[PDB]
Ligand binder design. Structure first.
Ligand SMILES: COc1ccc(CCN(C)CCC[C@](C#N)(c2ccc(OC)c(OC)c2)C(C)C)cc1OC
Ligand SMILES: Nc1ncnc2c1ncn2[C@@H]1O[C@H](COP(=O)(O)OP(=O)(O)OP(=O)(O)O)[C@@H](O)[C@H]1O
Ligand SMILES: Nc1ncnc2c1ncn2[C@@H]1O[C@H](COP(=O)(O)OP(=O)(O)OP(=O)(O)O)[C@@H](O)[C@H]1O
Ligand SMILES: [Mg+2]
Ligand SMILES: [Mg+2]
Length: 1156
């Protein structure tokens, strides 16, 4: 897919013009080097009227700068605008195709995956085609023009530069490869600690229950040691790469200076020519190297566009926009589905429909019979043309469905799904989407027929009542009524209904059925429902069976036949950050960071030191004396450069050595602390979307980088830039004053332009993301419910909505592109203007015999090159704002403290426990939703030698009762006593270790089976004999021994090798290993091999001796086993007492006993 540009051939002229302008701009700079060399030669000759030549050179430079500014502006703006238009066209076409694709194909591919692909690849293509191509062309032009200037300026110097360049290129490539490999290795190494932390967090409930934070922290630290070693190595490698790059650059500078000096002394090209050739060649090589990101983005967008086009270029079997079918004006109710075989493309192995014969008259309430997966919903979908028969025939009114106008059939048909959904728009908006041609009378008619008058009118904006995201403001019955009204709005030739009132209750069932039967003579109504009451009244009823119809006839006939229908009938019967707090790693590298500070100062002086060395070298030729021995002096100066280079390399050898060693350490500290803070966090805090397992893992992982950057690299860059600026400014002021003022007025304008570049880039990215998300809200709303939209056949409406939502920000995108191009051009414009003005005014100054040309050149080079290097260094460090925010969040998390300290030292820990507990007037809903008080003041009391059972409120929050008993949360109200003692005042770890609490679906940590067993209670070693005894007690001795490797075997990811029964048995064995005084099981039975579950329960009852056992199970046996049974209802104990008395009561216990 190399050739990606595919639209607006006329607009392609914009691309051609932009390419030409970029080439002109790129070739401009070598011309700048040539003219600067000529000006330097003129100045040197003056050292050996003058104002006239200086004015001519300044005029040439100013003209070149203005032309380069115009070219840059034109190229940037044109490329950006053309790419934006192309991206808009691509997005529009892509969304059109997606909405026009096949429904079955959409079911084939993930909806979320496709939505993310669109919303991401759009920006990927925009980035890879926006300006990176323009910058690449400009860099190629710079390379070509620099090479041409070098060749036309001299042979020996050009050869030397060409020989120097590829060594630097290869060194840069090797350094980049090493850095990438180191980063990948470090991420892989840290993955172990990341997995450990993720497992701990996900198992947070079990971890807190067992109080095993110590072992997890130890493992995390063990991994973090190697992780920090690798990170320090990688940081040192990156710093050494930068150092070696600078050292090689300086060495090339010194070698070129020596060679040019020798040539000039030998009568070769003048000093100006040699300097121009050298600088032009170096800058061209720099541009060639800097062209890489454009090519990388080109390749990335190439792959993205290949995938996107493949998606778009797909030709769907069912096309919404297609109109090749014949659409008769008069439709008479007549449907035929003969030998209709149909299989889901998602699951092609099984043919859900294996052929059947069925006919449908006109205006007949055809009803379908069959159990789940019998072929009812799929039958309707095939009838609705959502798919086609694998082997069969489908026709309407004596005509094949495919042989008719797809759009007309879709519009003239009505489909009501068992799970109706309304778009996120006002009820009136959704109704209009159902039928725009209603004319405001059909709306009222439907509202009255479906009874959408009271509910519809009640909400604010009776007709225009807005519905929350996904229609969260409407109830199930109201939603079903609205869907029915919307279906009736179209008044289709035929309609189909499923799950009339299968949402919450049959109250709407009566009204819904009455309304549906009110208007059914004029159109055939496919009847689908979960209640035989509605099915009985059907005029015509037919059965389904394994993709075939056997039973048939009305309710009376079906009952007489005593078929499957008769069987069903019988069955019915943003905190602020602290900058100083950031200095918490000083305890590690406070004296160590001094070496890094010294290295940074050394580099920031070396830059201006190189400036001074170059000034001296230039002055050597500028010296009128020009002795032969001056060459030696020149060599001396040249030698200095080489020395400076070494000082650079060693300097880097220190920087990465220090900061790395510092930063990783700090990282480790944070890693040791942040997660530790998470460990000592109340379970209440864990109940929060902000504290999401994935979110917490990402914060822990993608925060060490931010904190380390903000701490180390921010200070490093600040110090380096400050040192460079101070040294340069001081040197320039010492060597002249007026030129110092000129350079100080010139350079900061360029610096401000460079900063504004990044500011505008970030702001534009944010604004583009905002607008794209604005459009994508509606895009996704349509995509997720794609089936409903297709049924409605209103795809054009969503297409128009997306078109408007994209056009509205398209103009803003174009304007931003134009402004950014203008600013980018102005950057180079100011650059060249200042470059020329500095030379002009320095020539004026020296013409007055005030300042020597050598000093002026020194000051100018210092200012310009130092400013450029400072900007590059500032860009080198990652973003401070994002790093600052991440550090603020990490510091807030670490400083966070728990209302109840799980690691608190103090705590009431009497000699033993009374084996009793009491909770009266208990009140605690939850942290997330306090609007639902769960405990309404229940009463519960456990004593010695008694087991408690929970019944009645199977869903009111019984598990919450166990959780609170474990102190997982804090009661909203109600007194609680631990064996007549303050539960809160009790010990922290003592209570956690004492209680053998289990969960519904325990997740076994992916460690050794023996390791999992021993995880029951740390701080007291668990000899393998104890594990064996616990396994024997919990029927796990045979299970553990039979399992390969015996106890040595380790469970996979949450015990993937063993079924849920094995995991439950292992959890029970671990609990028994804990040997708790009091034990609790909460709905761990389920089915889980009913005989096996009963055996496990019997073992537990035999294990309940000398302990208080809490039992929460949905099995009558569990109710019988419990010594004491307490019910729950309305947050209170509806029933309680003995099992015989509870059964005697006519209460929820009686209903459960009878029904169960
Ligand atoms: C797209 O990025 C670029 C932007 C502008 C330029 C041209 C810069 N010229 C006006 C010369 C200024 C000085 C210069 C820079 N930058 C520089 C001086 C000293 C340096 O330290 C040794 C240096 O290395 C970072 C670069 C160039 C010699 C490469 C090159 C670019 O490619 C690197
Ligand atoms: N991609 C798929 N592959 C296989 N089976 C699927 C697929 N999508 C849905 N199914 C299921 O296959 C069955 C097809 O039968 P159909 O839905 O027509 O009858 P049903 O008994 O009314 O269905 P359901 O049990 O869904 O209410 C349904 O149970 C449906 O949920
Ligand atoms: N942080 C929370 N905020 C709000 N509701 C929560 C929170 N955590 C859990 N819940 C809800 O509390 C209930 C948990 O206890 P639940 O009612 O399921 O216990 P139960 O009586 O054993 O019922 P069942 O066995 O039917 O699930 C669930 O409704 C769960 O959605
Ligand atoms: Mg169904
Ligand atoms: Mg439960």
């Amino acid at each position: 897919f190399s050739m990606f540009r595919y639209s607006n051939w006329l607009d392609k002229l914009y691309m051609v013009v932009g390419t030409l302008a970029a080439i002109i701009h790129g070739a401009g700079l070598p011309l700048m080097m040539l003219v600067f060399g000529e000006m330097t030669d003129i100045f040197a000759n003056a050292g050996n009227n003058l104002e006239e030549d200086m004015t001519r050179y300044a005029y040439y430079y100013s003209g070149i700068g203005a032309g380069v500014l115009v070219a840059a502006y034109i190229q940037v703006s044109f490329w950006c605008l053309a790419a934006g238009r192309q991206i808009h066209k691509i997005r529009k076409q892509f969304f059109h195709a997606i909405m026009r694709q096949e429904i079955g194909w959409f079911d084939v591919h993930d909806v979320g995956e496709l939505n993310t692909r669109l919303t991401d690849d759009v920006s990927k293509i925009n980035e890879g085609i926006g300006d990176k191509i323009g910058m690449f062309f400009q860099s190629m032009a710079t390379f070509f023009t620099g090479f041409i200037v070098g060749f036309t300026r001299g042979w020996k110097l050009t050869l030397v530069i060409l020989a120097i360049s590829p060594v630097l290129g290869l060194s840069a490539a090797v350094w980049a490869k090493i850095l990438s490999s180191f980063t990948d290795k470090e991420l892989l190494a840290y993955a172990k600690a990341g997995a450990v932390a993720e497992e701990v967090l996900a198992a947070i409930r079990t971890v807190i229950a067992f109080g095993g934070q110590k072992k997890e922290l130890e493992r995390y630290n063990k991994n973090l040691e190697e992780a920090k070693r690798i990170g320090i190595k990688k940081a040192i490698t990156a710093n050494i790469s930068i150092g070696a790059a600078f050292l090689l650059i300086y060495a090339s500078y010194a070698l070129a200076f020596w060679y040019g000096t020798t040539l000039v002394l030998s009568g070769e090209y003048s000093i100006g020519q040699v300097l121009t050739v050298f600088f032009s060649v170096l800058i061209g090589a720099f541009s060639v190297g800097q062209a890489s990101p454009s090519i990388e983005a080109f390749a990335n967008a190439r792959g993205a566009a290949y995938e996107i086009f493949k998606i778009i270029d797909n030709k769907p079997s069912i096309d919404s926009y297609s109109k090749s079918g014949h659409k008769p004006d008069n439709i008479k109710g007549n449907l035929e589905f003969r030998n209709v075989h149909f299989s889901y493309p998602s699951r092609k192995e099984v043919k859900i429909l294996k052929g059947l014969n069925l006919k449908v008259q006109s205006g007949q309430t055809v009803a379908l019979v069959g159990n789940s997966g019998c072929g009812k919903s799929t039958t309707v979908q095939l009838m609705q043309r959502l798919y086609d028969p694998t082997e069969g025939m489908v026709s309407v009114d004596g005509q094949d469905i495919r042989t008719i106008n797809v759009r007309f059939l879709r519009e003239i048909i009505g489909v009501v799904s068992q799970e109706p959904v309304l778009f996120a728009t006002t009820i009136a908006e959704n109704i209009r989407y159902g039928r725009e041609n209603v004319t405001m009378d059909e709306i009222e008619k439907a509202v009255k027929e479906a009874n959408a008058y009271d509910f519809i009118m009640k909400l604010p904006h009776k007709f225009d009542t807005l519905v929350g995201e996904r229609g969260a403001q409407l109830s199930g019955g109201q939603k079903q009524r609205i869907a029915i009204a919307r279906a009736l709005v179209r008044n289709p030739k035929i309609l189909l209904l499923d799950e009339a009132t299968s949402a919450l209750d049959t109250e709407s069932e009566a009204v819904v059925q009455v309304a549906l039967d009110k208007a059914r003579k004029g159109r055939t109504t496919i009847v689908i429902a979960h209640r035989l009451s509605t099915v009985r009244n059907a005029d015509v009823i037919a059965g389904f069976d394994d993709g075939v119809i056997v039973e048939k006839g009305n309710h009376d006939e079906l009952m007489k036949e005593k078929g499957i229908y008769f069987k069903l009938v019988t069955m019915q019967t943003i905190p602020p950050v602290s900058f100083w707090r950031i200095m918490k790693l000083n305890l590690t590298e406070w004296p160590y960071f001094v070496v890094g500070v010294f290295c940074a100062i050394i580099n920031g002086g070396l830059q201006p030191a190189f400036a001074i060395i170059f000034s001296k070298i230039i002055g050597v030729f500028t010296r009128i004396d020009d002795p032969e021995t001056k060459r030696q002096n020149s060599n001396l100066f040249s030698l200095l450069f080489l020395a400076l280079g070494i000082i650079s390399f060693i300097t880097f050898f220190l920087q990465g050595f220090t900061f790395g060693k510092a930063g990783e350490i700090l990282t480790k500290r944070l890693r040791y602390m942040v997660f530790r803070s998470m460990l000592r966090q109340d379970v209440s805090w864990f109940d929060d979307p902000k504290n999401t397992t994935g979110a917490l893992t990402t914060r822990l992982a993608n925060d060490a980088a931010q904190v380390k950057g903000a701490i180390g690299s921010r200070l490093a860059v600040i110090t380096q830039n400050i040192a460079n600026l101070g040294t340069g400014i001081i040197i320039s002021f010492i060597y002249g004053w007026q030129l110092t003022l000129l350079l100080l007025a010139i350079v900061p304008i360029i610096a401000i332009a460079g900063v504004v570049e990044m500011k505008m880039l970030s702001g534009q990215a944010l604004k583009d993301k905002k607008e794209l998300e604005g459009s994508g809200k509606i895009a996704t709303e349509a995509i997720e419910n794609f089936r409903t939209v297709v049924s409605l056949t209103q795809e054009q409406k969503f297409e128009h909505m997306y078109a408007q939502s994209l056009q509205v920000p398209y103009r803003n995108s174009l304007r931003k592109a134009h402004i950014f191009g203008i600013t980018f051009s102005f950057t180079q414009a100011m650059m060249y203007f200042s470059y020329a003005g500095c030379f002009r005014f320095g020539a004026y100054l020296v013409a007055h015999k005030l300042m020597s040309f050598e000093d002026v050149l020194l000051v100018f080079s210092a200012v310009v090159f130092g400013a450029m290097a400072v900007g590059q260094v500032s860009s080198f460090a990652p973003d401070y704002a994002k790093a600052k925010i991440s550090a603020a969040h990490i510091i807030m998390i670490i400083e966070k403290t728990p209302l109840i300290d799980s690691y608190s030292t103090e705590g009431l820990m009497p000699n033993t426990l009374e084996g009793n507990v009491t909770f009266g007037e208990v009140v605690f809903n939850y942290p997330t939703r306090p609007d639902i008080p769960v405990l309404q003041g229940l009463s519960l009391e456990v004593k010695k030698g008694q087991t408690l059972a929970l019944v009645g409120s199977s869903g009111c929050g019984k598990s919450t009762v166990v959780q609170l008993l474990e102190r997982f949360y804090d009661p909203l109200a109600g007194k609680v006593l631990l064996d007549g003692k303050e539960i809160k005042r009790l010990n922290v770890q003592w209570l956690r270790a004492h209680l053998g609490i289990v969960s519904q679906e325990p997740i076994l940590f992916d460690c050794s089976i023996a390791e999992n067993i021993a995880y029951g209670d740390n701080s007291r070693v668990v000899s393998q004999e104890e594990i064996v005894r616990a396994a024997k007690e919990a029927n796990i001795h045979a299970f553990i021994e039979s399992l390969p490797n015996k106890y040595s075997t380790k469970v996979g990811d949450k015990g993937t090798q063993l079924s849920g029964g094995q995991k439950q048995r292992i959890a029970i064995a671990r609990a028994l290993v804990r040997q708790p005084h009091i034990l609790l099981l909460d709905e761990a039975t389920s089915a889980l091999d009913t005989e096996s579950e009963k055996v496990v329960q019997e073992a537990l009852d035999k294990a309940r001796e000398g302990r208080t056992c809490i039992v929460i199970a949905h099995r009558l046996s569990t109710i019988q086993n419990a010594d004491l049974i307490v019910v729950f209802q309305n947050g209170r104990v509806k029933e309680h007492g003995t099992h015989q008395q509870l059964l005697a009561q006519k209460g929820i216990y009686f209903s459960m006993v009878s029904v169960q």
